[PDB]
Design a protein around this ligand. Structure first.
Ligand SMILES: N#Cc1ccc2cc[nH]c2c1
Ligand SMILES: N#Cc1ccc2cc[nH]c2c1
Ligand SMILES: N#Cc1ccc2cc[nH]c2c1
Ligand SMILES: N#Cc1ccc2cc[nH]c2c1
Ligand code: NA
Lengths: 301, 301
């Protein structure tokens, strides 16, 4: 089962889920064993504190049943890691708002703009009318590409001149979305790396200006991060969460990275729903995150 | 690849998968719509019981999600139909036995003998040695076709005179396969005229097999023809008569009634090992439920 997800997770599977099978084969449960396991979890980008949590519950659970063969750790690990992901299994529901405003935050070059396009096309396939706000206002090439993408797919894109105030663009977009009975408004934002404090105050300004038109907006604050960037994904999540308060995460580029295990760190450290995972190039490969599917593909033996 | 798979399903896609799109376009979610959808599933050979389950789950999930637009039923239906096939998505693994014995059951004229040849060539291509047993012993023309095929393809075929005891032929083939360290033995009657006979003959075959290897047959594989509820009915008969462990469904291409795969999956819960979607050896595809669903529900809008 799950042949496509298993292929996407091939490099992750070398260290997590099925990768544990060779690590445990014919070993006994002792400190040597748990030390090897901790090393492997850290190599897989699971994170220092998440790994310590797993080893602790795993060691206590082994002791209680007086488990002796390391092979018996497998089911316990699958349960422990499964519960980490279950806590952030919650599909995004955009129904019933006029418009449902998604604020897309995150650094440039990690699939934020790709994710906007795929979400837009999915929502329109669902029968919703979508509009985009080109809030990354100082990147003239990014804004023009977004506008060209909108013209190609008959989706309105609200934009202003290079250097325009992003909070102004997004205000004008909410106003236009409301006038045009738009169901989902997806607002891009700047993702420059220099000067982190400036970007964060810019996002807080956007949120305050939105609330001049709708106090429930933004209805979703969605971070996009790229699994191939390993722990940098965690550090980005922390920065954006502390600044504007995330309500959802999209984790892209799971296919072809050995660092997919960063999902556990993201899930455990923040408890924010992971709404979507990106497991390939298709629109349909931005998949709603389903924890038990992910675990099954990972641990399938 | 995936593009050939989509093309091979175009006729079934008229009414299932992407065939649902025109049905939902601009409609409200009400009983008229669910009635039309139920009728469309039944026409596609999904089956009364399986259709009732799909419609019930879809209706409940639409309510809970508070859906407004019929277009949004598409993703829920893709998930419901995908879950039916996920539950029978276990691949056949023929490795590690001397020989791995596949007992091929099914009626005559549904691609059973074609499937035997394609599997034999696929296994050979993977580096495994293969033997066939001509267990359809009262049909002289069929035995000779199988012998001719084995001659043409340099694969040994164990056979006896017309009217030989099937279980004895298969007994002799397992003996020979074991002596020659053959990796895979594929054993071929499929007469439904007196079904009480055919079924008792299968139980005799299995009993005799177990004299030489208590694990044999390692797989009991039914073959049925997707272009034929006859295929649903043959699976019921063989399922109750013998313990099926796998199912091959042939001729999915060029037929517009692709729902039998869903009815078979849901009613019996037996793994679907292979689907035949064309004339080439490789068009007998190891079944991947996720690939199949994606091809069936592929949409470009
Ligand atoms: N998916 C997606 C996508 C593809 C191209 C562009 C260009 C600007 N935004 C885009 C989004
Ligand atoms: N265009 C624009 C616009 C309109 C109102 C406010 C309020 C704060 N920024 C704004 C920008
Ligand atoms: N693939 C295949 C195939 C087609 C015809 C016969 C007849 C006896 N074995 C057969 C195998
Ligand atoms: N050829 C043949 C054969 C040999 C032994 C037994 C035992 C039961 N059936 C058998 C058939
Ligand atoms: Na499968």
């Amino acid at each position: 089962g799950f042949a496509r997800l298993k292929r996407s997770l091939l490099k992750t599977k070398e260290n997590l889920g099925s990768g544990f099978i060779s690590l445990f084969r014919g070993k006994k449960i002792d400190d040597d064993l748990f030390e090897e396991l901790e090393e492997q979890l850290l190599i897989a980008d699971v994170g220092v504190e998440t790994t310590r949590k797993i080893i602790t519950n795993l060691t206590e659970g082994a002791s209680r049943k007086q488990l002796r063969d390391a092979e018996a750790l497998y089911g316990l690990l699958k349960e422990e890691m499964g519960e980490i992901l279950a806590k952030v299994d919650e599909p995004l529901n955009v129904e019933g708002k006029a418009p449902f405003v998604i604020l897309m935050v995150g650094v440039n070059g990690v699939g934020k703009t790709t994710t906007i396009g795929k979400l837009a096309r999915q929502f329109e396939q669902q029968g919703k009318s979508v509009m985009l706000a080109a809030g990354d206002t100082f990147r003239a090439a990014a804004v023009e590409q977004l506008q060209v993408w909108g013209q190609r797919n008959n989706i309105p894109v609200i934009a202003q001149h290079t250097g325009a105030d992003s909070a102004s663009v997004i205000f004008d977009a909410i106003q236009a979305a409301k006038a045009r009975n738009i169901d989902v408004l997806i607002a891009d934002t700047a993702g420059r790396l220099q000067n982190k404090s400036h970007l964060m105050e810019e996002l807080k300004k956007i949120v305050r200006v939105m609330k001049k038109l709708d106090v429930e907006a933004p209805h979703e604050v969605m971070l996009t991060i790229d699994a191939s960037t390993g722990q940098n994904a965690v550090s980005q999540a922390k920065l954006f969460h502390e600044a504007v308060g995330l309500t959802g995460i999209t984790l892209t580029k799971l296919d072809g990275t050995a660092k997919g295990g960063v999902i556990f760190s993201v899930a455990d450290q923040f408890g924010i729903p992971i709404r979507y995972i990106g497991v390939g190039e298709r629109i349909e490969d931005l998949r709603p995150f389903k924890a038990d599917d992910f675990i099954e593909a990972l641990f399938a033996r």
